[PDB]
Amino acid sequence: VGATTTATRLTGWGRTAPSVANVLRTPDAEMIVKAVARVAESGGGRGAIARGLGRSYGDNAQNGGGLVIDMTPLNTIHSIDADTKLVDIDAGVNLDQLMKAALPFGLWVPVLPGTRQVTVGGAIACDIHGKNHHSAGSFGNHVRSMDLLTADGEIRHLTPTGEDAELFWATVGGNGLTGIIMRATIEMTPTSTAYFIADGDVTASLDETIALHSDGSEARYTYSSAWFDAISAPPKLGRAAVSRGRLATVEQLPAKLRSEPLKFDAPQLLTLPDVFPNGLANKYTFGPIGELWYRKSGTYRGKVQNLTQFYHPLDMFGEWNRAAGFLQYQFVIPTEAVDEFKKIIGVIQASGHYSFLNVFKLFGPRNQAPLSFPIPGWNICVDFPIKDGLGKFVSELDRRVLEFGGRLYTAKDSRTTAETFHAMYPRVDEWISVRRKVDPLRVFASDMARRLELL
Ligand SMILES: Cc1cc2nc3c(=O)[nH]c(=O)nc-3n(C[C@H](O)[C@H](O)[C@H](O)COP(=O)(O)OP(=O)(O)OC[C@H]3O[C@@H](n4cnc5c(N)ncnc54)[C@H](O)[C@@H]3O)c2cc1C
Ligand SMILES: COc1ccc(CNc2nc3cc(C(F)(F)F)ccc3nc2C(=O)O)cc1
Numbered sequence: 001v002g003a004t005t006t007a008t009r010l011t012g013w014g015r016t017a018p019s020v021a022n023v024l025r026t027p028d029a030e031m032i033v034k035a036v037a038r039v040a041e042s043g044g045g046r047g048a049i050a051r052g053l054g055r056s057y058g059d060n061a062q063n064g065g066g067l068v069i070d071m072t073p074l075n076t077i078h079s080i081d082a083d084t085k086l087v088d089i090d091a092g093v094n095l096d097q098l099m100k101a102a103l104p105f106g107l108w109v110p111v112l113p114g115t116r117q118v119t120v121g122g123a124i125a126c127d128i129h130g131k132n133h134h135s136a137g138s139f140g141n142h143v144r145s146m147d148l149l150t151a152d153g154e155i156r157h158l159t160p161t162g163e164d165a166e167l168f169w170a171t172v173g174g175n176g177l178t179g180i181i182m183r184a185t186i187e188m189t190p191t192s193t194a195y196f197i198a199d200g201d202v203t204a205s206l207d208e209t210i211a212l213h214s215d216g217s218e219a220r221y222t223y224s225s226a227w228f229d230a231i232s233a234p235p236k237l238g239r240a241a242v243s244r245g246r247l248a249t250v251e252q253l254p255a256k257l258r259s260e261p262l263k264f265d266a267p268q269l270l271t272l273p274d275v276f277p278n279g280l281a282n283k284y285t286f287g288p289i290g291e292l293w294y295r296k297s298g299t300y301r302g303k304v305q306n307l308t309q310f311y312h313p314l315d316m317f318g319e320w321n322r323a324a325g326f327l328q329y330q331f332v333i334p335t336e337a338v339d340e341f342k343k344i345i346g347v348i349q350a351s352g353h354y355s356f357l358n359v360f361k362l363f364g365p366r367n368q369a370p371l372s373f374p375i376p377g378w379n380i381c382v383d384f385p386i387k388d389g390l391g392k393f394v395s396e397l398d399r400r401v402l403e404f405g406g407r408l409y410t411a412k413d414s415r416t417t418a419e420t421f422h423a424m425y426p427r428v429d430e431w432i433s434v435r436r437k438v439d440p441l442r443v444f445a446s447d448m449a450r451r452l453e454l455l
Contacts (some may be wrong), residue, residue: 002041003031009257010068015324017414019064019447023051027073029182036180036273037153039067040443047445050176052119053094056126058414059447060175064444069180071121078183080105085188086144089120091181099307103262107188108247110142112311121181126411126443127173127372131311133362135222136189138374140172141367145364146184151443155182172369175410177371177435177444177454190248191330196223196310198245202298206238206345210338213362222246223310228358230348230382237349238342240360241298243336245310253304265306294422314357322356322383327415330381332363332374333406340404341378347400348382351393355382370427370434381412391415410448419451428454 003026011018021024024035039048046066053072054061062068074092081087082105089098096116099109111123112130122128127140136142148156148171156179158168171178199221203209209226226240250261257263272280284290308315333341348355359381366375384390398420401408407424408416422428432454442455449455 001027003028003192005360008068010054010057010062012058012061012414013054014223014326014328014414017059017062019059019062021063021066023068023070025073026068027075029074029198030067032074032180032182033149033155035067035069036149036151036443040151040441043441043443045348047443048090048180049444049449050121050125050180052092052125053117055115055118055122056247056411058410058412059451060126060410060449061122063445070244071119071180074182077101080107080188082106085190086185087188089186090183090185091119091124091146093120093162094118095120095123102188102263103194103264105188106191106262108191110136110187110189111139114312120184120186121176121387124181124184125174125176126409127367127369127374128411129363129374131223131225131361133374133379134218134224134362137365137367138372140169140359140369140372142187143172143422144166144185144187146171147182148178149180149182151179151439151441152198166434167438169367169369170371170431170438171373172367173410174369174431174435175371175448175454176446178408178438179444180383187449189247191262192250193248193253194247194256194264194306195248195253195261196305196307197248197252198243198300198303198305198310200298200300200303201242201244202295203240203242205235206342207235209238209240209242209360210342212242212317212337218243218362220244226360227313228360228380230345230358231354231356233349234346238345239296243310243313245305248304257304265308267308267315272316272321325386327384327386327390327394328381328412329384329397330379330409330412331401331406331435332377332409333401334375334377335362337377337404337406343402344397344400344404345380347397353384353387353393355384355391357381357383370431371410371425373411375405375407410452415450416452421452 008023048067049063051061051068068072071092074090076090078088113128123139125137129138143161221244224244229239363374
């Protein structure tokens with residue numbers, strides 16, 4: 001299939017801040033190189049940015065009045081090796097495609113986000129994190145090389161420790177602003193099964209949620225995350241359903257499943273909105289029997305689960321989740337600032353803004369990428385319905401997050417200011433200097449670049 005350059009109205013996943021750009025779409029690498037050579041001959045214009053599957057909520061994969069390059073047609077898996085654990089894939093392959101192709105080799109995608117519909121390029125450019133951050137770091141940690149199409153029209157082969165480690169690490173979490181990742185080699189995690197052994201716990205309050213994450217139990221699990229109550233007044237505020245686990249070995253599987261330990265099950269036809277259309281509430285739900293039931297069902301040990309059960313637990317709730325019109329907000333607060341983190345949770349609950357879907361986890365050590373989002377500490381994602389006062393309230397949350405040494409995530413943001421973002425990322429000047437060195441003419445530009453003064 002040939003090249004196609006179309007004027008397209010683009011938004012992130014949040015369906016907000018739309019802007020019109022020329023979308024180039026081609027499986028031909030030579031053609032992508034030529035477009036970048038074209039933009040650069042100009043050589044100052046409104047530039048270009050790569051786009052993956054558009055799963056970022058904000059404006060990092062759009063470029064109003066300029067060019068956008070859709071990378072999804074470059075989706076070749078070149079090789080997978082079980083012995084070296086390395087995969088060599090085009091930047092356009094997505095993590096679901098990769099997971100499925102790698103399982104028969106006993107290989108596991110080392111960092112999986114809450115949706116598998118993300119490209120390798122998008123996973124690198126946002127240095128994405130998953131349920132295992134505290135044990136495996138973020139996506140960038142597992143990249144062994146990548147080929148970066150730079151502004152000068154050349155393709156630079158980058159490694160994390162080689163000659164241009166600096167450019168490598170500016171590209172990790174760089175939001176497409178150092179060039180176009182064409183291709184990458186990733187080191188996979190070995191596995192004997194496609195299953196998890198999981199322990200579930202239900203806490204009664206915010207204080208309990210924090211204690212559970214601070215009692216040392218986190219180190220017994222490679223994977224850990226929680227669903228968090230952000231609407232109930234204290235003491236119920238910040239109670240959580242915690243899901244922790246690790247990949248199962250074949251010995252740990254029931255005999256029924258040992259025949260095909262690496263098998264991935266197809267997603268079921270029926271979801272919970274399908275079997276129970278008008279909700280799951282009864283007369284017991286919100287009283288003491290409801291609390292007991294919820295606590296009992298969410299407390300367990302050594303439960304064998306496939307990926308969907310362990311890792312995408314709310315796929316069950318199907319049509320019920322988020323029912324556009326929502327603002328996604330994710331931040332992390334450094335571990336030591338526990339009181340400050342608790343204070344921010346209190347602010348949210350008293351705001352008059354109600355988020356039903358709240359993902360909580362304790363991040364581990366950060367990496368050397370100057371713009372990487374994750375830092376060790378308390379991470380949470382909340383989802384606010386758009387309504388009066390919200391924009392001004394999230395600006396107040398920004399101030400609180402900043403003051404308490406934390407940051408927002410670019411993959412979620414469409415509204416923070418440049419001033420706020422720069423203070424949240426003290427290594428931003430260091431990063432900008434790398435960018436100016438590798439792209440003096442601003443061949444690469446995006447709506448986010450301009451909003452956040454990263455240009
Ligand atoms: C339901 C849902 C759940 C999510 N859960 C998580 C989670 O648990 N953890 C997490 O970290 N994130 C999560 N995300 C965010 C998502 O993982 C990131 O936004 C990711 O970057 C999206 O990948 P994409 O291919 O859709 O990239 P896009 O949104 O299309 O692009 C994002 C950025 O990547 C850059 N980029 C894309 N391809 C290339 C390339 N080839 N070369 C250079 N730059 C490139 C773009 O220019 C842009 O700056 C979630 C998103 C959704 C919608
Ligand atoms: C359709 O219903 C669903 C089902 C699953 C999800 C998972 N979402 C998410 N899970 C996340 C999990 C983490 C984790 F676990 F901390 F790594 C971090 C960010 C996350 N962000 C999101 C997001 O929404 O952007 C979101 C909506």
